[PDB]
Amino acid sequence: GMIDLDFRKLTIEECLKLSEEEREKLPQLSLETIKRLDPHVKAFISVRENVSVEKKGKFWGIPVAIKDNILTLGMRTTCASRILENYESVFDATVVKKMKEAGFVVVGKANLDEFAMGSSTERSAFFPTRNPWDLERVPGGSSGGSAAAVSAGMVVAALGSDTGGSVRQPASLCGVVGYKPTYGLVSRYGLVAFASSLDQIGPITKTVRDAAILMEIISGRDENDATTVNRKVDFLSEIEEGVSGMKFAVPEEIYEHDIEEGVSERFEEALKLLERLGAKVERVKIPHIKYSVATYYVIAPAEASSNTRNVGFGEEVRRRIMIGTFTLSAAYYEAYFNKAMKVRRKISDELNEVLSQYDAILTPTSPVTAFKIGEIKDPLTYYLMDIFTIPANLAGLPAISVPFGFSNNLPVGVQVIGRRFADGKVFRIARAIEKNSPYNENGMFPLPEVKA
Amino acid sequence: GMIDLDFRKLTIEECLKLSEEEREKLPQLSLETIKRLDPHVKAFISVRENVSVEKKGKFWGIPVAIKDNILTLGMRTTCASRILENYESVFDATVVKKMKEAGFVVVGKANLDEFAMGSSTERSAFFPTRNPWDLERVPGGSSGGSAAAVSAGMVVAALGSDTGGSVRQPASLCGVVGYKPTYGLVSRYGLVAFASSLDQIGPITKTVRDAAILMEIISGRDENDATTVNRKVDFLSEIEEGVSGMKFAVPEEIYEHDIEEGVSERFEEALKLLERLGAKVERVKIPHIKYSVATYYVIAPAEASSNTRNVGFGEEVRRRIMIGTFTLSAAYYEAYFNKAMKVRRKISDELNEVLSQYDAILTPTSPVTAFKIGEIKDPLTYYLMDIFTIPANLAGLPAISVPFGFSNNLPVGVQVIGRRFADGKVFRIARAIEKNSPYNENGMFPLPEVKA
């Protein structure tokens, strides 16, 4: 329909059907929605100056948020760090150039864990972002600002970054779609990143098709990023064709961890839905998958490190211990990086073996729904939040999180993982889940209505 | 003989034969020797006020150094930290009470790595200690000040502390005897320590018998340290009885690392000497011994943690990474402490299996001779300096380092490791090596003569 009946609910595809008059109001209406909702959600670090809308590109006028570790003209890029509070790149990341050339309007920069080092957005130097479904709770992370902004309807879509789950996991916790493409499909030129072998930029959206559309836009060879491939992948063409006759694998490992009961229940229902649509679902055993998290935590940080009062006894001891731990960790990386890379190859091989016989691997995106801000102080617990998302980064595989109902009144995500360059199939499977979900209305997952 | 012919060369047993007049001069002569030599060696953090010599106790007048992580009346205990530069315990550690009751005179506090966290003494907050055999070089650590003071002859003997080699290794590098007793024989009450399951205080001496004598003094049950055992061990009685008919084990693992050639050569000669004295020497395979170092570095630190310019981007990034590494290490300890303890039990079991069939295990104390101050910056290299000493702490076993000639004009140490509470046998084996060494004169290893 041609009229914008509720800006918060708008998808990219609905925007395309708006009359020109209604469409040219979108960037301003986004700014107004941010002004109303962001004092509660705290998704944004900065917003743009409201300016004339260009009617250039197919996707002209459509407002989007960009995670603030992605460099942008016009607005500062803080990486949610105090030291970069006033930093201006005067330069657009390749993915931002692409978005803007397609017509999208970057209305703001979204909050993140400082330097993208976290899983809940609480480590932002500025403030925590709050989950639109429950403002006491985390939106996940590190792309929490981006997921919260989409969920709350402040923007139509967003970009985040994903090293070990940081697009998929916040999308899961906020009840929106989060996509991480095959390694090599999206330029990291303009991403302020500490792990070259693991990161992709990915879209966060209100629908599965909207994520495929952004993938069509941001993907492609970039001479400024030598990791980008020349292979063209079609994300959208087959998206409606369903999953009848497909075969899906579920890792036994999922069942060997005590996850949130409602998350388990939602996941089993998704599996049953897939069987009703004419697919088969089988448990598989992936021998080295249990080493994924430990392997990730050698490689990702190894990469990062290679890119008057009668007081003070406590501080000095803590300092010495902290400096000591740092030097010891350096030793560990030296002793164990090569072995971690061998284990990474092995995990990757085993996943490719599974994906030679099955169309995709299915897991819950997260073992839990959104936890409270200030709730998780246990280090081991915190670092296990990416348990199910990490393997796709290790193996360079396409993976999507798609909402599938609720647990404890909070959104649950289901993850589809495909073989390298099978992004189109991943999107096709995800779309079948969304279209047929008993928790969606007309193939669309509910979006929360934050009180102004 | 009754005359002190050269203070630097004096042993505890020689002191006992001095005339009263010559003996009462020792504490003052120690202070004078420190004044002359310590500007070059830098072994001491503090020295005592020269006072009247009491003639009480069998060992009256005999000057000794105490590592500055051991609490002492009269003098400050800095732990080689700036924050404790002016700290006074007003309290003697149990081992210091024992020493003083026996008559020994504590003339000074010896330098160490700050809070005993190191293997070369270079991490002293105050200054590095320098090897008396070559002042460009490290004395080892963390008890480097104590070993250097004995070697240089500033004192007759000293006490250090040993968590993963920190008595044995500096003794090895300085060409003196270093002893680490069976776990449970020596009180840690008054040791400023971060690892309860691994640490013993031990003596550093000019002769093997002098170390047995100090063990007789400092050992014993202490109600202030519940880890101290009631079992009495005789260190001295059998010390002269030799090794004829004994059987010794050499771990195959020694040969699977590229160690300093001269260290290997000295070690093989010690093995041959033992066979000439009527013992047999056999290589053994200890399956899990290769996991010792990794296991140690989970447990010891786990324990420690449980006890205007347009500038600044670099510092903030380093800070974030350092804080990040610290939290991740905490997660690691949480995930892996119990497993490390299982591997520790296994290593300990295997060592006990070896020590049921062999009288002792023999290794080089160190894979290298003393390196240059400022030379070792590689973390992995640095943390491998205790490769051969760590296992005795893991298994709670008695172990001694005894000098056996030189490599690259620097002292080499040979290590004897015994079964729990077989300290007397360890001393007996070590004494046979010293007595018969082709590098000793009259059963005594040369001591370096630092130029005033």
UniProtKB/Swiss-Prot annotation, chains A, B:
Disulfide bonds: none annotated. The active site is at 67 (charge relay system), 142 (charge relay system), 166 (acyl-ester intermediate). Pfam families: Amidase. GO terms for molecular function: ATP binding; glutaminyl-tRNA synthase (glutamine-hydrolyzing) activity. The keyword Ligase applies. Keywords: ATP-binding, Ligase, Nucleotide-binding, Protein biosynthesis. GO terms for biological process: translation. SUPFAM superfamilies: Amidase signature (AS) enzymes. GO terms for cellular component: glutamyl-tRNA(Gln) amidotransferase complex. Its EC number is 6.3.5.7. PANTHER family: GLUTAMYL-TRNA(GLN) AMIDOTRANSFERASE SUBUNIT A, TRANSAMIDASE. Belongs to the amidase family. GatA subfamily. Heterotrimer of A, B and C subunits. Allows the formation of correctly charged Gln-tRNA(Gln) through the transamidation of misacylated Glu-tRNA(Gln) in organisms which lack glutaminyl-tRNA synthetase. The reaction takes place in the presence of glutamine and ATP through an activated gamma-phospho-Glu-tRNA(Gln). This is Glutamyl-tRNA(Gln) amidotransferase subunit A. It comes from Thermotoga maritima (strain ATCC 43589 / DSM 3109 / JCM 10099 / NBRC 100826 / MSB8). The gene is gatA.
